[PDB]
Design a protein around this ligand. Structure first.
Ligand SMILES: *[C@@H]1O[C@H](CO)[C@@H](O[C@@H]2O[C@H](CO)[C@@H](O[C@@H]3O[C@H](CO[C@H]4O[C@H](CO)[C@@H](O)[C@H](O)[C@@H]4O)[C@@H](O)[C@H](O[C@H]4O[C@H](CO)[C@@H](O)[C@H](O)[C@@H]4O)[C@@H]3O)[C@H](O)[C@H]2NC(C)=O)[C@H](O)[C@H]1NC(C)=O
Ligand SMILES: *[C@@H]1O[C@H](CO)[C@@H](O[C@@H]2O[C@H](CO)[C@@H](O[C@@H]3O[C@H](CO)[C@@H](O)[C@H](O)[C@@H]3O)[C@H](O)[C@H]2NC(C)=O)[C@H](O)[C@H]1NC(C)=O
Ligand SMILES: *[C@@H]1O[C@H](CO)[C@@H](O[C@@H]2O[C@H](CO)[C@@H](O[C@@H]3O[C@H](CO)[C@@H](O)[C@H](O)[C@@H]3O)[C@H](O)[C@H]2NC(C)=O)[C@H](O)[C@H]1NC(C)=O
Ligand SMILES: *[C@@H]1O[C@H](CO)[C@@H](O[C@@H]2O[C@H](CO)[C@@H](O)[C@H](O)[C@H]2NC(C)=O)[C@H](O)[C@H]1NC(C)=O
Ligand SMILES: *[C@@H]1O[C@H](CO)[C@@H](O[C@@H]2O[C@H](CO)[C@@H](O)[C@H](O)[C@H]2NC(C)=O)[C@H](O)[C@H]1NC(C)=O
Ligand SMILES: *[C@@H]1O[C@H](CO)[C@@H](O[C@@H]2O[C@H](CO)[C@@H](O)[C@H](O)[C@H]2NC(C)=O)[C@H](O)[C@H]1NC(C)=O
Ligand SMILES: *[C@@H]1O[C@H](CO)[C@@H](O[C@@H]2O[C@H](CO)[C@@H](O)[C@H](O)[C@H]2NC(C)=O)[C@H](O)[C@H]1NC(C)=O
Ligand SMILES: *[C@@H]1O[C@H](CO)[C@@H](O[C@@H]2O[C@H](CO)[C@@H](O)[C@H](O)[C@H]2NC(C)=O)[C@H](O)[C@H]1NC(C)=O
Ligand SMILES: *[C@@H]1O[C@H](CO)[C@@H](O)[C@H](O)[C@H]1NC(C)=O
Ligand SMILES: *[C@@H]1O[C@H](CO)[C@@H](O)[C@H](O)[C@H]1NC(C)=O
Ligand SMILES: *[C@@H]1O[C@H](CO)[C@@H](O)[C@H](O)[C@H]1NC(C)=O
Ligand SMILES: *[C@@H]1O[C@H](CO)[C@@H](O)[C@H](O)[C@H]1NC(C)=O
Ligand SMILES: *[C@@H]1O[C@H](CO)[C@@H](O)[C@H](O)[C@H]1NC(C)=O
Ligand SMILES: *[C@@H]1O[C@H](CO)[C@@H](O)[C@H](O)[C@H]1NC(C)=O
Ligand SMILES: *[C@@H]1O[C@H](CO)[C@@H](O)[C@H](O)[C@H]1NC(C)=O
Ligand SMILES: *[C@@H]1O[C@H](CO)[C@@H](O)[C@H](O)[C@H]1NC(C)=O
Ligand SMILES: *[C@@H]1O[C@H](CO)[C@@H](O)[C@H](O)[C@H]1NC(C)=O
Ligand SMILES: *[C@@H]1O[C@H](CO)[C@@H](O)[C@H](O)[C@H]1NC(C)=O
Ligand SMILES: *[C@@H]1O[C@H](CO)[C@@H](O)[C@H](O)[C@H]1NC(C)=O
Ligand SMILES: *[C@@H]1O[C@H](CO)[C@@H](O)[C@H](O)[C@H]1NC(C)=O
Ligand SMILES: *[C@@H]1O[C@H](CO)[C@@H](O)[C@H](O)[C@H]1NC(C)=O
Ligand SMILES: *[C@@H]1O[C@H](CO)[C@@H](O)[C@H](O)[C@H]1NC(C)=O
Ligand SMILES: *[C@@H]1O[C@H](CO)[C@@H](O)[C@H](O)[C@H]1NC(C)=O
Ligand SMILES: *[C@@H]1O[C@H](CO)[C@@H](O)[C@H](O)[C@H]1NC(C)=O
Ligand SMILES: *[C@@H]1O[C@H](CO)[C@@H](O)[C@H](O)[C@H]1NC(C)=O
Ligand SMILES: *[C@@H]1O[C@H](CO)[C@@H](O)[C@H](O)[C@H]1NC(C)=O
Lengths: 127, 95, 300, 134, 113, 122
């Protein structure tokens, strides 16, 4: 679990912080990313863990790059925001709330959010 | 007019040529030469070989033009070259 | 004069036991193996049911001419396979639906003597005491093999007319590897006569074991390269090997005769045919996921 | 082994002369096999080469130095084995090497008498010509 | 990724978006499983590095402005999307695969300009 | 990946860019074989991890997926003090980062800051 499996929990820190601070510190945290039985039987298991971490990271990166944001931690997309998803101000979510409570708010909607992003990227590629 | 587009994730196979590793469940307790070649040159067998069957598939087979057997022929030539040595061997060598 | 000078190498014979072990072939990383489970495989053509496997089944590397001893059994019935029909230059390969069990014994008493009188008693006795070392007789059951021959002529009716009779002769002639069934048990190479085995003709609307003699030759023509070899003398102990017969190799004599009576002879001689008989339905492939497809789509 | 011997005295040169293969015979005589190798019954490779009817093998053995009047346990020369089975040319070659027409086995039978007994008069006339010119 | 190949062209174009979401014995078989997984990942990254030239990097379905000869397809192309699968179509244009890749790379070269 | 790069290392850098492009288009015996296989697999896994790290660093710089990417940072004569005409002909790639090893970090940071400024401009 060394390396990529360590940086899966690398960004888990400051989870209870302000919504506006974590999005700025994503770039810094991503910049901060850097005898017989031991090497025949024991080594292949840590090799399995490392290649599982790599497979999970590439699966997540490919799912992120569906929406045209390959290699971008922060990207802006032309999907309009429906008022039924949030019906709240932009100020109070970024000044008061945290990421955990916000995903508790939009866990009902994020399934159709991902699909509408895929459809919008498909319509962008169509024209 | 028509324009070229690219597609990824597409289930397309193509036939090709590669070296195939032999597999044999050999215990090497005996001093048999065919057994010791199987231990020295091959791995043990698959316990749970994964069989995946396709519903709709179309495949043109040509086993007379099959390459797979051409490598295994030289494999058996190596097998009996390391396994059996005659008392006298002769081959013609012509300039 | 082209200088063709033979080179020979003499090294001491190991004289060791030899048995075939069933081995498997698997595809490496990035490659796959496709398998056809259709019974009517036809050799060349499309297969309806193709399934992917990671390894082959049990392949026994056996070398034998005109018959296949250890091999896979046919699933439903007897099929024949050939690259071309009536080309009379390519081998025809047959897989039997039922196994024909063949057993072969060699007498190890070495006590056969004849009371010879007159001149030449020493050479007769020498020939007898040499031929007792090199003599064998294999058994073939008539009841099962006649039924399999009746099945294979019924399957052969389809490809050739079924209006004129077919018949079987013995081997035409040539090298002793082709004309006799050459098979090894215990490291000793046996040349078996098959003249009486294919002896009967067949006409449409149609417990004892026939023995077949086998002479042992110490000089073989090897199948890898062209040449000759010599091996160790046979072991004084008894060698008995019990095995199936799974495959049959036949060459069809082309007929310009107006009667068009087909003649079939036991052929063989190429072991690439023998290993094509067991890898007939398998292919090796690689995965190419990236592809192109033209459509009316504008960029940006 | 070039000079390998079994329990019954047969070297590979005996079987090489027996089975009618010239290349193994040449190779063995090049490597240094015994051209006068004898078994428990006194059989030389010239005996097995002459009796079965292989001409060139007899020539390769005789130019390598095989004995022409070599005797087995029964006292039979290779001439008796050559005239035993109606091989005229082998008899002619052995008399060209100088086989003894007066040589008798332990049964007191010459090549003359076994050529008469086998009913091959053509070999007997050649043997009579060889005995007259001796 | 080779599974579900029995569907046609227009169905595979939709399902690719669905796809977007005794010790020595055990060691010598697990090491070959590791070769399979690592070379699968390496082939994926190599193909993405190849696709980064064409401008469609990270995108399963893309569009270019590369001209297509009517001689390569040699067909009206209306019925290839509904009843004809990918495996036959790849064998239709197997002789003409390298030249169109060369056409894409220089087309992206003046797309840079 | 990394093993194929090191061949033709000391060739001239102008031809090295083009060959870089056409490059990147792309029972003791059994135990010994398995232990060197697992060593080779560990080498390949760490090669993939280093490639992932450097690709994500290029994504920080905004050059993700591009082996040759153009930026807008102006070149400074105090960094190298070398003419443009002979740098691409009479100098290899290996001598170039030997010639600048103290000054690569300020270039890295100023490139990151220029990418952040370009993102801020939107
Ligand atoms: C197709 O497949 C079948 C099935 O495998 C093969 O049939 C085998 O044929 C071989 C002959 O080559 C048979 O092997 C013989 O076994 C005899 C019995 O002894 C065995 O069992 C004892 C007790 O378990 C062991 O200690 C012993 O090592 C053997 O494993 C042996 O007597 C035979 O010779 C042995 O003894 C002599 C004595 O001088 C030695 O010199 C020999 O080197 C050897 O050690 C011989 O090994 C075998 O039993 C058959 N299998 C069966 C019937 O199931 C076919 O041969 C095969 N077809 C072809 C063409 O290969
Ligand atoms: C499979 O075998 C058949 C024969 O059983 C092959 O058919 C034969 O092919 C030859 C070669 O083309 C033909 O010979 C030609 O004959 C014409 C006159 O008819 C002559 O002008 C040509 O110069 C040439 O010699 C032959 O006619 C033909 N038919 C027979 C013998 O009945 C067939 O080609 C084989 N196919 C494969 C794929 O191997
Ligand atoms: C297939 O069957 C035929 C018929 O039985 C076999 O032909 C026979 O072959 C032997 C030699 O192999 C012949 O013996 C020889 O006869 C001549 C006659 O002059 C004699 O001088 C020789 O000393 C020797 O004895 C035999 O005559 C011959 N029979 C016929 C009817 O032609 C053939 O050999 C068989 N082939 C195989 C591969 O089994
Ligand atoms: C925001 O989402 C709601 C649904 O959560 C959308 O409401 C739909 O509106 C259409 C007409 O515009 C109705 O026919 C549907 O019955 C409504 N409900 C559903 C569940 O679809 C609303 O249109 C969306 N607004 C925007 C701007 O996208
Ligand atoms: C079995 O395979 C043979 C192979 O020759 C098929 O024969 C075809 O026959 C047609 C008849 O004109 C020829 O045009 C083809 O060239 C032949 N070969 C092929 C590969 O198609 C035969 O049709 C096959 N039979 C079955 C039932 O599959
Ligand atoms: C195989 O067996 C047949 C007999 O079934 C052999 O044919 C005999 O050959 C001898 C030798 O010339 C003749 O004297 C007999 O008259 C033949 N008999 C028949 C019925 O044809 C044949 O030679 C054997 N094959 C080999 C290679 O020895
Ligand atoms: C000859 O064929 C018979 C019939 O298939 C073989 O007997 C089979 O052996 C396998 C292996 O143990 C068993 O799984 C089957 O149940 C047997 N079937 C029958 C009907 O007995 C026999 O093993 C073959 N001979 C050789 C030497 O392989
Ligand atoms: C290019 O390099 C020069 C020299 O390194 C830079 O010069 C700066 O000069 C001021 C003078 O007061 C110093 O305070 C800075 O510390 C120097 N900076 C460095 C990096 O040493 C100059 O700023 C650099 N930038 C450009 C593009 O002109
Ligand atoms: C946690 O809450 C306290 C409450 O005053 C605040 O001072 C502190 O800054 C918060 N922690 C972080 C990391 O923001
Ligand atoms: C949202 O913001 C507007 C403008 O700042 C303000 O007038 C309004 O009262 C706010 N509503 C809530 C629920 O905070
Ligand atoms: C922030 O959230 C807490 C808890 O929901 C609430 O009590 C408080 O009034 C909020 N403050 C503002 C300024 O909205
Ligand atoms: C989201 O789904 C859960 C499922 O139990 C439900 O309890 C909750 O009320 C839903 N929230 C919204 C806003 O629809
Ligand atoms: C593919 O297989 C399915 C199996 O349910 C079948 O319904 C479908 O018709 C097949 N597609 C064809 C034959 O094009
Ligand atoms: C070999 O000897 C045994 C026992 O004396 C006997 O039963 C058998 O018949 C003999 N074999 C032959 C071929 O006579
Ligand atoms: C099988 O052949 C042997 C000779 O090798 C013989 O002794 C035996 O009787 C034969 N078996 C049958 C059933 O005829
Ligand atoms: C050999 O096979 C024959 C087949 O006809 C059979 O009758 C006989 O019993 C078998 N003998 C042995 C010892 O298995
Ligand atoms: C057995 O063989 C004879 C030919 O010798 C044949 O006439 C008969 O039909 C065969 N019996 C079968 C096939 O049941
Ligand atoms: C025999 O040949 C005829 C053609 O004359 C064919 O119709 C038939 O299917 C063939 N097979 C049988 C078993 O009659
Ligand atoms: C078959 O074998 C018998 C044995 O009696 C023999 O007489 C006959 O000539 C052989 N050939 C044919 C074609 O019947
Ligand atoms: C077709 O290919 C040729 C090259 O052979 C090319 O010059 C032409 O532009 C292409 N397109 C058309 C519409 O002819
Ligand atoms: C292609 O198909 C369309 C629709 O059926 C038809 O109108 C057109 O004429 C066809 N073109 C050719 C060249 O066949
Ligand atoms: C591709 O080229 C080969 C080369 O001979 C040719 O046989 C084949 O028919 C071609 N495929 C086509 C034109 O679809
Ligand atoms: C190495 O230098 C020589 C100088 O003559 C040149 O010919 C050769 O091409 C160079 N090799 C490489 C790989 O650049
Ligand atoms: C060196 O730099 C000067 C000034 O930029 C330029 O004129 C000249 O062409 C360059 N090259 C050489 C070889 O002097
Ligand atoms: C390249 O530099 C060397 C000194 O390192 C010099 O001797 C040579 O003449 C230069 N050649 C060119 C092409 O300027
Ligand atoms: C680069 O920095 C090192 C660190 O002290 C120094 O030794 C070296 O001389 C410097 N090189 C140049 C060209 O300034």
């Amino acid at each position: 679990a060394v390396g990529i499996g360590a940086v899966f929990l690398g960004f888990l820190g400051a989870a209870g912080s302000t919504m506006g601070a974590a999005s700025m510190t994503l770039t810094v945290q991503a910049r901060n990313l850097l005898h017989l039985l031991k090497l025949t039987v024991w080594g292949i298991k840590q090799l399995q863990a490392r290649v599982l971490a790599v497979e999970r990271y590439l699966r997540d990166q490919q799912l992120l790059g569906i929406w045209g944001c390959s290699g971008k931690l922060i990207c802006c997309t032309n999907v309009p925001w429906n008022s039924s998803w949030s019906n709240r101000n932009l100020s109070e979510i970024w000044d008061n709330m945290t990421w955990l409570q916000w995903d508790k708010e939009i866990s009902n909607y994020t399934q159709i959010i991902y699909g509408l992003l895929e459809e919008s990227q498909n319509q962008q590629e169509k024209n | 007019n028509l324009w070229v587009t690219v597609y990824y994730g597409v289930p397309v196979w193509k036939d090709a040529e590669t070296t195939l590793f032999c597999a044999s469940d050999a215990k090497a307790y005996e001093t048999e030469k065919h057994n010791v070649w199987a231990t020295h040159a091959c791995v043990p067998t698959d316990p749970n070989p994964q069989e995946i069957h396709l519903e709709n598939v179309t495949e043109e087979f040509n086993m007379w033009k099959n390459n797979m057997v051409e490598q295994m022929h030289t494999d058996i030539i190596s097998l009996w070259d390391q396994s059996l040595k005659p008392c006298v061997k002769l081959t013609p060598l012509c300039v | 004069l082209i200088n063709c000078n033979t080179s020979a190498i003499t090294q001491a014979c190991p004289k060791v036991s030899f048995e075939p072990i069933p081995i498997h072939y698997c595809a490496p990383a990035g490659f796959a193996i496709l398998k056809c489970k259709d019974k009517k495989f036809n050799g060349t053509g499309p297969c309806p049911s193709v399934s992917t496997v990671q390894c082959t089944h049990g392949i026994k590397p056996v070398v034998s001419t005109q018959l296949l001893l250890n091999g896979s059994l046919a699933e439903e019935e007897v099929m024949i396979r050939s690259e071309n029909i009536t080309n009379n230059a390519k081998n025809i390969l047959v897989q039997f639906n039922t196994p024909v069990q063949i057993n072969c014994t060699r007498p190890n008493n070495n006590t056969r003597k004849s009371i010879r009188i007159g001149p030449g008693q020493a050479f007769y006795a020498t020939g007898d005491i040499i031929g007792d070392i090199r003599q064998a007789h294999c058994n073939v059951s008539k009841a099962t093999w006649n039924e399999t021959l009746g099945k294979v002529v019924k399957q052969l009716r389809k490809h050739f007319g079924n209006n004129t009779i077919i018949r079987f002769a013995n081997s035409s002639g040539g090298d002793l590897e082709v004309t006799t069934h050459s098979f090894n048990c215990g490291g000793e190479f046996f040349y078996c006569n098959t003249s009486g085995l294919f002896n009967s003709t067949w006409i449409s609307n149609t417990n004892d074991s026939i023995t077949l003699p086998c002479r042992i030759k110490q000089i073989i023509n090897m199948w890898q390269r062209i040449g000759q070899a010599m091996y160790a003398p046979p072991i004084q102990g008894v060698i008995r090997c019990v095995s199936n017969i799974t495959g049959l190799i036949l060459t069809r004599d082309g007929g310009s005769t107006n009667s068009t009576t087909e003649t079939f002879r036991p052929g063989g001689g190429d072991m690439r045919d023998n290993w094509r008989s067991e890898l007939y339905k398998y292919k090796v492939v690689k995965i190419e996921p990236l592809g192109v497809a033209p459509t009316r789509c504008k960029r940006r | 082994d070039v000079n390998a011997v079994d329990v019954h005295g047969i070297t590979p040169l005996h079987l090489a002369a027996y089975f009618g293969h010239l290349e193994i015979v040449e190779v063995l005589l090049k490597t240094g096999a015994d051209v006068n190798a004898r078994d428990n019954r006194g059989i030389t490779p010239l005996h097995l080469a002459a009796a079965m009817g292989h001409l060139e093998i007899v020539e390769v053995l005789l130019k390598a130095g095989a004995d022409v009047n070599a005797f087995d346990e029964a006292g039979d020369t290779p001439l008796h084995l050559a005239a035993l089975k109606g091989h005229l040319e082998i008899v002619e070659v052995l008399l060209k090497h100088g086989a003894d027409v007066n040589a008798q086995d332990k049964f007191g039978k010459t090549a003359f008498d076994i050529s008469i007994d086998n009913g091959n008069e053509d070999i007997a006339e050649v043997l009579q010509k060889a005995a007259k010119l001796n």
